[PDB]
Ryanodine receptor 1
Amino acid sequence: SNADRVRIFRAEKSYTVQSGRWYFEFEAVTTGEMRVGWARPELRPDVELGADELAYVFNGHRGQRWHLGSEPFGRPWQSGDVVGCMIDLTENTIIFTLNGEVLMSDSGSETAFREIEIGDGFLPVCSLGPGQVGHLNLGQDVSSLRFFAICGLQEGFEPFAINMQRPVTTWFSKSLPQFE
């Protein structure tokens, strides 16, 4: 029996962060096997996110946090729900929200992961199992973030897209009349 095909959406490695406090969202359209969170710049093939050391993710199918394996955490997704992903590379913590409300661990903690090591740094990541549908928003248009202002903005987290600069081709001219 062939294994499930899982799509993994890496960010360009050149956007990797080793400092600061960053924020992005992920909308669950379906309600099944998807994961979202923060990845190392290297991922191994044919391994699910957070099964090993290379990612720290939330699985909202039933509510799990994944890093070196799974644990019960948060609560399950409904269609339309938006997961907020936060990483704090000064405090060294990861926090998830669901429709702007922090997802608490089973033990009662706001931090989903703590005492994380900066190492090679982090990138936003998601995985989509077969059939599944979900959209990242890395916050190019900050106002488009649905729950940032409710939890993340005042808390000092910045939209991750600030780390992403459009490549450009420039055309120079000395002609004032062209720039009126």
In short: The two ends are 67 Å apart (CA to CA). The longest strand covers residues 21-28. DSSP finds no helices and 13 strands in the chain.
